[model samples]
Structures are given as C-alpha cells and as structure tokens.
Target: DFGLPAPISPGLEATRRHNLGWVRRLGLVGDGPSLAWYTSWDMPRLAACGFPHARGAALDLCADAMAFFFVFDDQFDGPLGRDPARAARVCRRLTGIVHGAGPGPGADACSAAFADVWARSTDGAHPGWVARTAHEWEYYFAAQAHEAINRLRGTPGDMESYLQVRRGISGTDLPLSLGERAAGITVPAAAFHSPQLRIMREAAIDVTLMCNDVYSLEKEEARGDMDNLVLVIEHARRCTRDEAVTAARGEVARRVIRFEQLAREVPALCAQLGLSAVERAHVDTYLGVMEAWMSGYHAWQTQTRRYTGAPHVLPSTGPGYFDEVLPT
Candidate 1:
C-alpha cells in the first residue's frame, strides 16, 4: 500500500449520478451488461477521491471527464488495440476536437463525449492553460497509437523506452489539469516546469502507472497485450512473473519516496521562483491533489471490479503487495 490518505469529495453521490446520466445521454454505453460494466468501473468515485476539494458542478465535470477517458481508452482493447491505423484515426479525431474542432457529421459516442468535455474544460479557461492541456492530450493520443503498434508487433521495448511511452500513456496531466480547474488555481509556468516540481509530477505518475501495471497484468496477459511493466521486467530481467512483481513493486515504492522528497522541497522551490503567497498555496494544493490521486486510486483499484473480477480480493502483487518496503 502507498499509505497516503484518501479523501472523498462531499459531492460524491451527486457527481456519480450526474456522470451516469451524462454517459447515457451521450450513448457511451448501451443498456444491459455494457452499461453495468461501465457502472461497475466507478469512474465517479475516482474523480471524487482525486479531486476531493472540488464541489458541485466542478466535481460533476471532473467525473464526466474521467468517465469519457476510460471509455475512450477501452476502445483500444478490441480490434482497435491491434490496428495502428484505426487507433491513429480515433486519436486524430479526438486530438482535433481538443484543438478546437467541432464534432462533425458521423461523430460517434466517444467523439461526442470528448467534444462536450473539451468545450466545458476550455469554456472560460485562459489560452495558456488550454494550450498546455491540449499538448498533453496530443501526447496521450500519440502514445496510445504507439501502444497499439507495440501490441500488434508484440514488442514492449526495453525498460527506458517503455517508461517513456508509459509516462505519456499514463495521461496524468489530464486529471491534474482538471484538479487545477476544479480548485480554480493556476500553477505558474515557472514553478510548474522547475526541476523539483517536474520530478515530483513524474514520480507521482510513475507510482500510479506502475501500480496499475501490476493490477492489470492478469487482464493484459489474457488479452495478449505485452506492454505492461511487470511483463517488461520479466522479459528484460529474465525473471519469473512472481519475481517481476517484486521488482515492479520495488520501483513503485522508490517512486513514492521520490514524490515525498520532492513534495517537501516545493516550498523552497516556490521561494526560489519568488512566487507570491497565494501562488505557493496553489502549488501546495496541486501537490495534495497528486497525493490524493495516488492513495485514492489504490482505494478504487482495490475495490473496483474493473481490475479484479471480484471486489476486495487484492490481486497478487507478490507476497509484499501490502507490506511496506523501504526505498532502495
């Protein structure tokens, strides 16, 4: 366990209901099993936990965006996952919408939902923030398309290259950006790109995706997807699945340490950047959001039927999955 505290938004239930209706309205999922599966994923709870400070409409919007992302990401699990050209087409369509294109004729549910979210996200935001978020989205789409190629070719690359692609695929920026919007706080560009904060952000993303890789290993293995961290470690280190799980979990623990270390240095970085008191507070709040994301994701991942076929049954991350380990 990451051992970070997870907080839920007071608006959790309302946002949950809102997201369900929004998804239905957009036709993102049909009735019966598909819809039931979508509900079982509990995207709203994720948003509520990760953006605990957001309330009312802000929380609702965050939940809708979370739901849209999961729906779009899942599209690749089928034929689209192995078809690079088709994946690129979908990515391009979404990227176009993010870059200000409207959902044109013949737009599907995913495209429509994305367009709606993009509109709401940028409705009153500054151009700079929109530009940064759009660039991050572009990176996400490109990485996703690349993942399809990897899946098709059955090559996940070495640890370094895999991490480069994995970081982009994590799409951590999307939710963090949404958190900023929800809290009405803008992290200044200087502070945002500084080494300390930048590394902190990377560490947070690393921890999240690494844990996710472990949790999703069984499902990905069943689907013949080899682009997981544990699988990559197994191939690279010439180790067993059990050994790889240990190594991956070790990395997750190290990154969590890195995140905490950098988090402690944020104040010094803020002073170095000569940020005002209010700006410093914004940065601190952003850091808390990242913490919540890490802890809250663990909570959701452990409980959600999306990863484990059954709830509350901790998927095997080896013997020490829940045991604490020091950073090495």
Candidate 2:
C-alpha cells in the first residue's frame, strides 16, 4: 500500500470515458454495487502505468480490458462467488467464447461483455498471445472457483497455495499478458517466456497482490473475508494484526528484492541470445512496462478512494517501494 499521487494523464481520462461508454452500451449496470464499482476502481489509473506510451485504439483497448477485468472480478466476488456451480458453468461459457468454441452464456450481460472485449483485445494479436491470454483468463476463473470453495469450506487455507490462486484471482496477470499484445511488442517466445523474466513478472504480481490485501484489508475484514496475506500471517504466526501487517510487509519486501535481481539479468540474457536491436528494444520496452506497473499500481492504490477511503493529495510520483526505478 504506497504511492504519492501520480499525475493523471489526459490519456487516462479519455480511456475512462471510453470504458464507461462501452459498459453503458452493454447494460453492465444494476442499481447498486455494480454501478458503484464501475465508478470506484481507477481502471484508467491502472492502464496509465503499463500503457503510458500507448495511444488511440491501442490505449482504448488496453484500458477497456483493464476495466472489464474489474467488472468481472467484482461479479466473481459478489454474486457468482456465492454459487460455485453457477460460477463454473458461467466460467465455462466464458472460456468457450475465448476460443470461439461457442456463444457466450445465454443472455448473460457479463459473458456478453467478456465476449466483446475478448474479440477486440485479441483481434490483431498474435495467435500465441491470444491463446496465452485465454489461458490466463481460464486460470483466473479457476482461481475464483477455488476461492468459492475456500469460502464455503470456511478454511484458513495454506498461504503458499492461496498465493498461487491469489495471483490469478487478482486478475493482474491477464492485463499484463495483454500489455504485450496492446503494445505490439514482438518479443520472441524464448525471450518472452524466459525463466528469468517469468520470475521478474511473478515478483511484480506478488508485490501487487500483497499491496492490494494491505489496502483492502479493512473492507475485506468488515465483510468477514479472511483470504488475505494479513489474515494468513495472523493465523499462521499467531500474531496481532500489527504483527501480521509487519510480517506481510516483510514478505513483499523480499519479493521486491527478487524482482530487482531478476530484472538485472534480463539484458544479459537478451545479449546472450543475440537478439536484433529492434527485438532488444521491444524487450526493454516490455520490461519497462512492468516497471511502470509496479510503480503505477502502488501509486493508484495509495491514492484511490477504492482502498484509501478518501481522496489523497498525491505527488507527481508516489512514495517508493519499487517506484525509484520507474521513469518520472
């Protein structure tokens, strides 16, 4: 949970307008939390991080995909989350649409929106990218099912395994995978999926999940949801809330260190593989986007009322964890 306020780019504001317009066009709103959630999460803020250099339709698609994910995540947490069977059925329908295997589930607006975004996001993307994005979405839905089981069983779940599911449930990975497609980064599969790079990406995801837990702990605790790092540490360590927070922070700090170490290995790997200059630049840009994500994510979390409970007077740059490495 960190960041001063990063300045809101005009691109972000425009993308928000585009995203909301799409949501309204598709009738994704009900009277209550659905509408409230649409306004609350800073989707544009999230997009600005990885898509800072994006423009036009690329920016719109990237931002829309990010916004769409929250829409889906909220539904998973609220309604579908309560009904595991229904969650599985709808998830199957949605996954089918990702592969063009079938139409979306009946007249479900959620699946319809998912179908539309999936078509647009992957339209001109590489087949591999599209497949990978769909794979990530499937993992995300599967994680949602796992959470439903955890909640129904009323279990204190293993933190390590919880984190495995948490990363996908967080829905950060899908947007990140889409970042490559949206940016048109032509990274080779060898370099793209290199073990070293995967580790770096996981670090970004781990830090993000923990920060989200820390910031949203109050509301989640209020709801009696204990599937969070803070609660996990509290139960396992048998410590006070403050101690759990401290311990959770310590875990995130270690992941941050691992991220730095792996990031330093990227260039050497690229060179060793003898990539062309253009390819090397794309790799650099992709990693740069990851850096922006690390910083921008923290910045948005600290500044957004979705977690902060009130508006924050933010700085041009947010307070640093990994932000020190990001461009101004």
Candidate 3:
C-alpha cells in the first residue's frame, strides 16, 4: 500500500505510537473534516444543497453572537458582567448543536454532559478544551482580534473575549448545515427575561451562524463562482484588526442581538445550571426578526430567479414570516 498524504488509517505500529493523538487531532479513520467537514468535501457533492451566502449569513450571525459574549465579558462585574461558570455552560450548550439532533435525541444526556463540562471549565482547572484553545487564539492575533477588542473597550486582559465560543463558531461553521432559512433560525432575544439568558442563547445562534459559513464556501466553489466568502472572512478579520468600523458594522449589530438574547434566556439558563435568577424580564421584542429575514431571503431569491435581475447576494425571508417550522 502506498499509504496516504495525511494517512487516515495508520498501521499497527503507528496506532500504538500516536493513534489516539491522530484521532483527536484529525478524528477517526476516514472521519475527516472535523466530524462535519462535508465528505468528498465538495459543495457539488450533495444530495440536496440550498444556501446562497452560507458563509456571509453565518458570519453575520456569528458577529451578533460574539456581541453577546462581549457584553457578558465587558460587564462581568455587574449583574451578569462575567461568570466563568456561566460562560463555560454557554460553550457546552452550543457546541456541536446538531451532534445529537435525531429521532432519539439525547436531550437529557446532552444537557448533563455539557452541564458537567461547564462546571469543570469554570472551576478553573483547565477551562476545558474549547475555552483553552479559544483563549490562545484570542491572543494569537492579539493586536487584530481578542486583544484589540478588549483594549478598545478599556477592559482588562483577564477579561478576554470568549474565543472558544468564537472558534467553535468558526470551525463548526458550515461543516453541518440543516437547510435554507434554517441557518439563522434561533430563539429570539425577547424569549428570555434575564440579560444573561439573552446572552447565552444569542451566543448559541451566533456560533451556529458562523459555523454555517463553511457551507456557503462550499456552495460558491461548486459553481466556480468568485463571490468568495472566505475572502470576506479574511478581510473582515483584517478590517476588524485594522479598526475598520464599516466592515464590522454588521458584526456589531448582530452582537447586540446576542446580548439581548442572553438577558432574556438568563432565567432558564440559571435554572438549568442550578443557579438562582437575579430578577430579569424576557419581554417579547422582535419575535420574528429571523423568520422575517429568512422569508425575505427566500422571497428575494425566488424573485431573482423568476425575473432577470439577480442580486449579488440573494436575500432569504426573515424570521417573522416563517412561523410554521418553529416549535409550538
């Protein structure tokens, strides 16, 4: 056997030496793409694919989610300014969101696993896997990202941007996508009453949204199209680093939504984690923003396809317009 480039299936000797290590870094044999990296890893190689600006939409969504984390970190000393435990919980809650989405969904077990992970992370032993790597990355491009963000806000180094949450969003972006309009679908910021709750939920959505970008990248490459979202991600990364406010405008707005969602979901999040609520109100605000946008995106796409004037990036219907798919 001529072996392989990365060697998915190492021989007996290889296994004993670093089999486990390889698996951890690159997943089991033939399980490339981080457990969700589109097999054949091609957009065209799909049973059914649907998403225009998969990466852009996800990035937009992620930017919103990070904003929520920013709030929690920035205001940690306040009511919900910062809680290592809570932050850890949020990471586990949203990690691999679709990992257990199935007929016999391991909702309870999943909940417990993450809860334990959350607790362990906050206890300060290792901060678990997610946060540790994320923290490193935050400072990895310190001048550009995590560091700059903290400095801009006049926050201390200890108050780091939850990079694991951010990186989770990045790595998971687009490895596993649900469907059209499903990309940005999430509990509205108004659903939760507590500020902390709002932040947590928003973080989940944002992380998912960012992760969805990988799908969009696949979509573009499939068509040999040059509307590169990877470029956007790279550019945005640089612009954010360079303090390009316009480039990061969308990110800023979406982040606010994360903050809003955290506030609303705090009560439930606290209850789940065996914590007491600090008195919050999850009043209904923009219940249909996502649906409206989703519907809007679809409607626009349909219109573009129907007519001759296609948009550079077709818009999907927003949240408010698609209440049918939402859980009753």
Candidate 4:
C-alpha cells in the first residue's frame, strides 16, 4: 500500500502446489486451524516476490523455510507466545539448532522445521552469509522473549522499540541472505556492508513489517496482540484507529520514498568506490530481488484472507475485540 507495484509471480500456481505438498510431507497440514493457517499463509507469493529465478528444488527450499517461519511465529500467539520464561527456553534450543547443534529437549514443530531448513540453506554457502543468518535468528528469538515480557506487562510499545524487534519476527533477514545464494551472486563484503545498501535493507524490513502490522491487525488483536505498529501508533499518539493507520501508512510511504531515492543513488556510489563489474552486478541483483519481495509482500497482504480477517479456509469467528470499537 506504500507506493508498491502489484506484480504477481509467473510460477504462482506451481509453487503453491509444491508448497502444499511440502506441508503434507512435513506434517504441517491436517484437519485443524494450526494447519489451516499454513495454507492461508501463502508462501508462493513470497517465492514469486523475491526469489523469482528460483524454481524446482530451490524454490521448494525457499517456500519450506517460509512455511516453517510462519509456524514458528504462530507459536507465540496465545499463552505460549506471551510467556517470557518459556520463550527463552525455546529460543535457546532453536538457536542451538541454527548454530549446528542437534535438536534436543522441548523441541517442537519450530525446531524440527528450522533444523531442516537451516541445513539445506547453509550447505556450501559462504560462511559470512551463514553466520549472518544465525545472528538474525538470535535477534529474532531474543526479540520474541522481549515481546513476551512487554505484552505480559500490557505495554503498547513505540515504533522504534517495536521495529528493533519486528524486523526479526517478520523473518525477512534470513531470506535476504538466502536470496544471494539462490541467485548465485556472492556479495562482496565491502559492498554488502556499505551504508547505502544497509539503508535499503532496513527499508525493506520496515516496509514488510509495517504492512504486515496493518493487514494482520484484526487477527492479532483478537488474540490480544499489542506488538503491532498501528496499535502502537494508536497508543502513542492517542489518536483514533483510522488516524493510527494514516500514521502507519505515512511512515511506510516515507521509507519507500527513501528507498527509491537510495536505489537510484546506490549504483553511482558503488561506481565511485571502483567496484568490479561482478561485484556491482551482485549488489544490483540483490536490490532487484529485494524490490520484488517488497512489491509482492504488499500484493499478498492485500489479497490474503489471513489478513482480511476471514481466513476463508479456517473456522468462523467474530471480529476481534477492538475491531468493532475501532474505525473501519
């Protein structure tokens, strides 16, 4: 919704079918809402979004990780999601798996799925990319624990604090790292760490998570979720629901505009620093891939029932507690 294009994936239907098969194979789908969320979560859209070149086995790997992260995120929705002590144990265990340890005690759907995806994603990849992914997961788990504490204390957090954690929970970093390997482009350490590219990456993360906060508001609030940007805007500004949405939209709009400006200038900046053609190409390709993800994320969020509050495939429920009380 933040000046993003409405691009669809050419391989959308095929990826959907293949991911559903992975769902069944991985024991993720069944006759229940937990499984139902996976189906509605829509991994193909993301595959089409950022990993357009990925197909067959490679695309499957992307979708599998996407699905696993969805399940992992859903783990924190109810009581399980709000318990800091419990979240810490689970976080530690999963981080161990990401760090190459075998799955051990208290391992559930998240651990099993993460272990499988981690191995496949890291096989023969650059050590730097692998380590970056592990670091992101560490951030993700710690943020979840922090969120649990905040939610338990009934905190309606601010955007700065929320975003620090939101990007990790959004699960964008891992895929950004994985996208490099999938595209067969190794980003030079210098180009990868440049301030320009880092800003672009942060913009992608900001847009992705902010859009999600808007679209998923209904479902999240139904489960007493206050870890949302819109809600935070509402609480922080003391404004009406529509006003908070307007604020969130404005926030996204500014970042997207900044991203566009950065995108136009980054190429020139890299050339000024005298990068080889190959290194330049790596930076360009990664940005192109990220743009697809940002556009696709907007498209999918607009179309999905999961965010639309119906989740057509799942059982019926009334609007969330704050839905009717808030503006349309």
Which candidate has the top score in TM-score?
Answer: 1
lDDT tens string, model 4, 1-328?
A: 4677765446667778887876666555554564565566677777777577565667777778777776566556555566788888878877788778977644454566677788888888888888888898788767778777777878677777777767766764776776666777778888777887889888887887888888887777666666799889899889999999999999889988988888998788788879999889888888877786778777767766566644333222432111111011
Going through the candidates in order, what is the number of backbone clashes in each? 0, 4, 56, 1
Model 2 weakest 10-residue run by lDDT:
319-328
Sort by lDDT, best first.
1, 4, 2, 3
Our tally of clashes for model 1 stands at 0
List the candidates' TM-scores in order.
0.91, 0.86, 0.21, 0.89
The Cα error of candidate 3 at residue 255, in Å, is 2.3
Number of the candidate with higher lDDT, 1 or 2: 1
Top model by lDDT, which number?
Answer: 1
The residue ranges of model 3 lying beyond 4 angstroms of the native Cα positions read 1-27, 30-199, 211-253, 256-328
Error of 1 at 250 (Å): 1.1
Model 1, C-alpha of 175: deviation from truth (Å) = 1.8
Show the lowest summed lDDT stretch of 10 residues, model 1.
319-328
Return the lDDT, model 2, position 98.
71
lDDT of 1 by residue, 133-218 (tens): 99988888788877877887786679988987787777857777888888778888898898987887777778778888989877
